[PDB]
Scaffold this active site. Structure first.
Site, PDB file in Angstrom:
ATOM      1  N   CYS A  37      -8.750  -4.439  -2.417  1.00  0.00           N
ATOM      2  CA  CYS A  37      -7.567  -3.798  -3.162  1.00  0.00           C
ATOM      3  C   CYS A  37      -6.679  -3.500  -2.243  1.00  0.00           C
ATOM      4  O   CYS A  37      -6.988  -2.711  -0.991  1.00  0.00           O
ATOM      5  CB  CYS A  37      -7.842  -2.797  -4.115  1.00  0.00           C
ATOM      6  SG  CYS A  37      -6.358  -2.017  -5.151  1.00  0.00           S
ATOM      7  N   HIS A  87       0.721  -1.228  -0.004  1.00  0.00           N
ATOM      8  CA  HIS A  87       0.080   0.071  -0.213  1.00  0.00           C
ATOM      9  C   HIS A  87       0.889   1.320   0.090  1.00  0.00           C
ATOM     10  O   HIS A  87       0.741   2.135  -1.041  1.00  0.00           O
ATOM     11  CB  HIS A  87      -0.912  -0.027   1.292  1.00  0.00           C
ATOM     12  CG  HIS A  87      -1.860   1.283   1.346  1.00  0.00           C
ATOM     13  ND1 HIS A  87      -3.002   1.365   0.927  1.00  0.00           N
ATOM     14  CD2 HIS A  87      -1.420   2.261   1.821  1.00  0.00           C
ATOM     15  CE1 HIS A  87      -3.578   2.402   1.358  1.00  0.00           C
ATOM     16  NE2 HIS A  87      -2.532   3.228   1.665  1.00  0.00           N
ATOM     17  N   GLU A  88       1.729   1.509   1.043  1.00  0.00           N
ATOM     18  CA  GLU A  88       2.621   2.567   1.079  1.00  0.00           C
ATOM     19  C   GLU A  88       3.485   2.692  -0.173  1.00  0.00           C
ATOM     20  O   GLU A  88       3.572   3.700  -0.627  1.00  0.00           O
ATOM     21  CB  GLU A  88       3.535   2.337   2.414  1.00  0.00           C
ATOM     22  CG  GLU A  88       2.602   2.180   3.682  1.00  0.00           C
ATOM     23  CD  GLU A  88       1.600   3.214   3.888  1.00  0.00           C
ATOM     24  OE1 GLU A  88       1.634   4.106   2.979  1.00  0.00           O
ATOM     25  OE2 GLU A  88       0.932   3.154   4.849  1.00  0.00           O
ATOM     26  N   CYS A 118      -6.121   0.031 -10.335  1.00  0.00           N
ATOM     27  CA  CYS A 118      -4.601   0.264  -9.785  1.00  0.00           C
ATOM     28  C   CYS A 118      -3.749  -0.257 -10.443  1.00  0.00           C
ATOM     29  O   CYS A 118      -2.518   0.350 -10.671  1.00  0.00           O
ATOM     30  CB  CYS A 118      -4.825   0.016  -8.247  1.00  0.00           C
ATOM     31  SG  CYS A 118      -5.829   0.838  -7.260  1.00  0.00           S
ATOM     32  N   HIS A 165       1.723   4.197  -3.116  1.00  0.00           N
ATOM     33  CA  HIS A 165       1.734   5.687  -2.930  1.00  0.00           C
ATOM     34  C   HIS A 165       2.980   6.304  -3.578  1.00  0.00           C
ATOM     35  O   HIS A 165       3.126   7.184  -4.227  1.00  0.00           O
ATOM     36  CB  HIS A 165       1.731   5.928  -1.533  1.00  0.00           C
ATOM     37  CG  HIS A 165       0.475   5.935  -0.801  1.00  0.00           C
ATOM     38  ND1 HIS A 165      -0.719   6.434  -1.574  1.00  0.00           N
ATOM     39  CD2 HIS A 165      -0.049   5.650   0.548  1.00  0.00           C
ATOM     40  CE1 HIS A 165      -1.825   5.995  -0.741  1.00  0.00           C
ATOM     41  NE2 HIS A 165      -1.351   5.679   0.534  1.00  0.00           N
ATOM     42  N   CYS A 198      -6.356  -4.005  -7.731  1.00  0.00           N
ATOM     43  CA  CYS A 198      -7.407  -4.093  -8.743  1.00  0.00           C
ATOM     44  C   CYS A 198      -7.310  -3.584 -10.047  1.00  0.00           C
ATOM     45  O   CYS A 198      -5.931  -3.114 -10.258  1.00  0.00           O
ATOM     46  CB  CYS A 198      -8.787  -3.158  -8.124  1.00  0.00           C
ATOM     47  SG  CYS A 198      -8.466  -1.404  -8.395  1.00  0.00           S
ATOM     48  N   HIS A 220      -5.621   6.577  -2.777  1.00  0.00           N
ATOM     49  CA  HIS A 220      -6.391   5.421  -1.910  1.00  0.00           C
ATOM     50  C   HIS A 220      -7.669   4.886  -3.028  1.00  0.00           C
ATOM     51  O   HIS A 220      -8.125   5.735  -3.552  1.00  0.00           O
ATOM     52  CB  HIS A 220      -7.170   5.994  -0.732  1.00  0.00           C
ATOM     53  CG  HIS A 220      -6.021   5.944   0.352  1.00  0.00           C
ATOM     54  ND1 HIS A 220      -6.201   6.969   1.081  1.00  0.00           N
ATOM     55  CD2 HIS A 220      -5.030   5.132   0.530  1.00  0.00           C
ATOM     56  CE1 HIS A 220      -5.060   6.869   2.195  1.00  0.00           C
ATOM     57  NE2 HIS A 220      -4.523   5.701   1.705  1.00  0.00           N
ATOM     58  N   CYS A 221      -7.888   3.730  -2.799  1.00  0.00           N
ATOM     59  CA  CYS A 221      -8.752   2.745  -3.763  1.00  0.00           C
ATOM     60  C   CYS A 221      -9.914   2.746  -2.918  1.00  0.00           C
ATOM     61  O   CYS A 221     -10.175   2.407  -1.935  1.00  0.00           O
ATOM     62  CB  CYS A 221      -7.958   1.884  -4.374  1.00  0.00           C
ATOM     63  SG  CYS A 221      -9.231   0.922  -5.516  1.00  0.00           S
TER      64      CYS A 221
HETATM   65 FE   LIG Z   1      -7.599  -0.647  -6.348  1.00  0.00          FE
HETATM   66 ZN   LIG Z   2      -2.554   5.426   2.265  1.00  0.00          ZN
END
Ligand SMILES: [Fe+3]
Ligand SMILES: [Zn+2]
Length: 191
Positions: A164, A148-149, A186, A152, A183, A158-159
């Site tokens: 996701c 996630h990080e 993304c 970025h 997803c 953010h999704c």
């Molecule tokens: Fe996504």
């Molecule tokens: Zn975040």
């Protein structure tokens, strides 16, 4: 390149699997550093937590100061000094509990402009909740919040899709519901 800076106070046996799953989910090579600690900065005594923004700035400074660690062999030293934040992304895995000014705590944080990010297993570990260790759960969680990080760092926001990787978890239950999955929306952006 993508560098997993694994603070060795976090069980180093989890290092390799986390590195390998981060690499699979990102579909990008990830280099592992797990033989050292990264002393944190910006501790807050009343909160008993560390300011992750300060740690991230310190992480950029460390990278720039450490060509012998992060600079590819085929990369000119002066080019590295100017552009290390564009090319050598770092994810720090730290044992410290993290906050940012607007938040009671965070599982992690990213500074896209400087290509540095951080995740803290402090609230990802079963033990924080008084539950017995579970290495597989902890790997799952670090991979998911780590990817996630790192997403970025590549410009993704953010999704909305709760399965996701880019979804922003309000709590640990939501994080566990995320899948090791970018997803469709993304993956296109990440490419
Ligand atoms: Fe996504
Ligand atoms: Zn975040």
């Amino acid at each position: 390149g993508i560098h997993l800076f694994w603070d060795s106070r976090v069980p180093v046996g989890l290092s390799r699997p986390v590195s390998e799953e981060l690499s699979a989910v990102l579909e990008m090579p990830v280099s592992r550093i797990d033989d050292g600690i990264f002393p944190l900065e910006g501790f807050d005594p009343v909160r008993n937590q560390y300011d992750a923004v300060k740690v991230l700035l310190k992480l950029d400074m460390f990278r720039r100061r450490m060509p012998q660690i992060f600079k590819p062999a085929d990369m000119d030293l002066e080019f590295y000094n100017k552009f290390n934040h564009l090319h050598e992304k770092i994810l720090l895995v730290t044992p410290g509990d993290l906050y940012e000014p607007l938040a009671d705590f965070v599982f992690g944080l990213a500074y896209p402009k400087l290509g540095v990010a951080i995740v803290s297993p402090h609230r990802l570990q079963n033990e924080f909740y008084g539950k017995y260790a579970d290495d597989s759960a902890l790997i799952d969680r670090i991979v998911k919040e780590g990817a996630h990080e790192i997403g970025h760092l590549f410009g993704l926001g953010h999704c909305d899709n709760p399965g996701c990787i880019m979804y922003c978890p309000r709590n640990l239950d939501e994080l566990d519901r995320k899948r090791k999955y970018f997803c469709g929306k993304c993956r296109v952006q990440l490419n």
